[PDB]
Scaffold this active site. Structure first.
Site, PDB file in Angstrom:
ATOM      1  N   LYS A  39       1.502   5.067  10.924  1.00 28.12           N
ATOM      2  CA  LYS A  39       0.334   5.935  10.990  1.00 28.12           C
ATOM      3  C   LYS A  39      -0.023   6.160  12.460  1.00 28.12           C
ATOM      4  CE  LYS A  39      -3.096   5.788   7.184  1.00 28.12           C
ATOM      5  NZ  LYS A  39      -4.141   4.940   6.578  1.00 28.12           N
ATOM      6  N   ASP A 131     -14.204   5.373   0.504  1.00 34.76           N
ATOM      7  CA  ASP A 131     -13.488   6.622   0.313  1.00 34.76           C
ATOM      8  C   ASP A 131     -12.433   6.489  -0.790  1.00 34.76           C
ATOM      9  OD1 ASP A 131     -13.045   9.359   0.847  1.00 34.76           O
ATOM     10  OD2 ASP A 131     -11.591   8.928   2.493  1.00 34.76           O
TER      11      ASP A 131
HETATM   12  C1  LIG Z   1      -1.312  14.297   2.911  1.00 35.66           C
HETATM   13  C2  LIG Z   1      -0.664  13.097   2.236  1.00 35.66           C
HETATM   14  C3  LIG Z   1      -0.752  11.770   2.989  1.00 35.66           C
HETATM   15  O1  LIG Z   1      -0.234  11.537   4.092  1.00 35.66           O
HETATM   16  N1  LIG Z   1      -1.456  10.822   2.356  1.00 35.66           N
HETATM   17  C4  LIG Z   1      -1.526   9.450   2.647  1.00 35.66           C
HETATM   18  C5  LIG Z   1      -2.676   8.844   2.171  1.00 35.66           C
HETATM   19  C6  LIG Z   1      -2.848   7.487   2.369  1.00 35.66           C
HETATM   20  C7  LIG Z   1      -1.918   6.759   3.082  1.00 35.66           C
HETATM   21  C8  LIG Z   1      -0.803   7.404   3.548  1.00 35.66           C
HETATM   22  O2  LIG Z   1       0.107   6.594   4.199  1.00 35.66           O
HETATM   23  C9  LIG Z   1       1.093   6.063   3.437  1.00 35.66           C
HETATM   24  N2  LIG Z   1       1.690   6.789   2.508  1.00 35.66           N
HETATM   25  C10 LIG Z   1       2.671   6.204   1.812  1.00 35.66           C
HETATM   26  N3  LIG Z   1       3.318   6.937   0.868  1.00 35.66           N
HETATM   27  C11 LIG Z   1       3.073   8.264   0.468  1.00 35.66           C
HETATM   28  C12 LIG Z   1       1.802   8.799   0.520  1.00 35.66           C
HETATM   29  C13 LIG Z   1       1.594  10.093   0.123  1.00 35.66           C
HETATM   30  C14 LIG Z   1       2.657  10.871  -0.345  1.00 35.66           C
HETATM   31  N4  LIG Z   1       2.394  12.203  -0.705  1.00 35.66           N
HETATM   32  C15 LIG Z   1       1.033  12.569  -1.067  1.00 35.66           C
HETATM   33  C16 LIG Z   1       0.843  13.927  -1.679  1.00 35.66           C
HETATM   34  N5  LIG Z   1       1.780  14.914  -1.169  1.00 35.66           N
HETATM   35  C17 LIG Z   1       1.545  16.232  -1.802  1.00 35.66           C
HETATM   36  C18 LIG Z   1       3.153  14.495  -1.354  1.00 35.66           C
HETATM   37  C19 LIG Z   1       3.496  13.164  -0.735  1.00 35.66           C
HETATM   38  C20 LIG Z   1       3.954  10.335  -0.345  1.00 35.66           C
HETATM   39  C21 LIG Z   1       4.160   9.027   0.032  1.00 35.66           C
HETATM   40  O3  LIG Z   1       5.348   8.377   0.019  1.00 35.66           O
HETATM   41  C22 LIG Z   1       6.392   8.908  -0.788  1.00 35.66           C
HETATM   42  N6  LIG Z   1       3.060   4.931   1.962  1.00 35.66           N
HETATM   43  C23 LIG Z   1       2.421   4.214   2.884  1.00 35.66           C
HETATM   44  C24 LIG Z   1       1.402   4.740   3.655  1.00 35.66           C
HETATM   45 CL1  LIG Z   1       0.574   3.792   4.877  1.00 35.66          CL
HETATM   46  C25 LIG Z   1      -0.605   8.746   3.407  1.00 35.66           C
END
Ligand SMILES: CCC(=O)Nc1cccc(Oc2nc(Nc3ccc(N4CCN(C)CC4)cc3OC)ncc2Cl)c1
Ligand SMILES: [Mg+2]
Length: 269
Positions: A39, A131
């Site tokens: 991040k 949140d």
């Molecule tokens: C805008 C989507 C986003 O970035 N949302 C998010 C929100 C909260 C935490 C985060 O970080 C992380 N995300 C993931 N995985 C993850 C998180 C979001 C998605 N998205 C969300 C919705 N989108 C439309 C497609 C992919 C895909 C992912 O893997 C596969 N794994 C670890 C962390 Cl620290 C990311």
């Protein structure tokens, strides 16, 4: 290829680009099969992005739990911050709901048992998330145990410690998930999160928000004018789930279910 401690990533491998963070897939530099999410500041909103990521480090370095996205490392500097976190390969609950439209009671129960486990740690540490919403609930497949899929709460940028005899008053969160006391600019406590959870559960059950409005301002006015709120629960809903939702979606925080009741609720058996 950038490095952060024992970890690396490339900015080709985007996970997502929120307003207050950009997140990339990466890995450990020795153990290449250990995947991570990294991040980073979103420079379009530098100051706020930097504040939120710094706050997230402060909260998450104190929380180890299977149902909370783990902070493996971090790197904070005057003009940059990075968090190295557990990769959640299943994405978010919001995308899953978009495909499923609604979830069965059994799935709701599986997910809610895990969220409650996380919330039990938060509550014991004196932390409020502020949140909770489907975009901040992530899914992970980490598997010869029954129901091995895991829910992980993410996005602790708005979270704070709240001493048990004190109230919070910062206006933050997402209007459609915010407790009435929050969006009406009143003092609140940890029960605000229980409202958010009730609204997630209701959304999983019915595919809609319990209290619809056209804008945040509209939703606020709605709560201001209505001294009791009663969500419409389908007749098919089981009695324990109906009772849980009615107890979580109480307008007035004094009447709302409290943590002990939530954790021991019959629905979660
Ligand atoms: C805008 C989507 C986003 O970035 N949302 C998010 C929100 C909260 C935490 C985060 O970080 C992380 N995300 C993931 N995985 C993850 C998180 C979001 C998605 N998205 C969300 C919705 N989108 C439309 C497609 C992919 C895909 C992912 O893997 C596969 N794994 C670890 C962390 Cl620290 C990311
Ligand atoms: Mg409250």
């Amino acid at each position: 290829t950038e490095t952060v401690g024992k970890f690396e990533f490339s900015r080709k491998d985007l996970i997502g680009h929120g307003a207050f963070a950009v997140v990339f897939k990466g890995r450990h530099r020795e153990k290449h099969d250990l995947e991570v999410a990294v991040k980073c500041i979103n420079k379009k909103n530098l100051a706020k992005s930097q504040t939120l990521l710094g706050k997230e480090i402060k909260i998450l370095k104190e929380l180890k739990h299977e149902n909370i996205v783990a902070l493996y490392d971090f790197q904070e500097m005057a003009n940059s911050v990075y968090l190295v976190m557990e990769y959640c390969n299943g994405g978010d609950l919001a995308d899953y709901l978009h495909a499923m439209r609604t979830l069965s009671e059994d799935t709701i129960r599986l997910f809610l048992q895990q969220i409650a486990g996380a919330m039990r740690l938060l509550h014991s540490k004196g932390i409020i998330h502020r949140d909770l919403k489907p975009q901040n609930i992530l899914l992970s497949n980490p598997r010869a145990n029954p129901n091995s899929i895991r829910v992980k709460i993410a996005d602790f940028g708005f979270a704070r410690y709240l001493q048990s005899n004190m109230m919070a008053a910062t206006l933050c969160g997402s209007p459609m998930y915010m407790a009435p006391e929050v969006i009406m600019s009143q003092h609140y406590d940890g029960k605000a999160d229980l409202w958010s959870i009730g609204t997630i559960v209701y959304q999983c059950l019915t595919g809609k928000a319990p209290f619809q409005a056209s804008s945040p301002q509209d939703l606020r006015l709605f709560y201001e004018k209505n001294k009791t709120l009663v969500p419409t629960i389908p007749a098919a809903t089981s009695a324990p789930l109906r009772q849980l939702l009615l107890a979580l979606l109480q307008r007035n925080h004094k009447d709302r279910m409290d943590f002990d009741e939530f954790f021991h609720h019959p629905f979660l058996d």
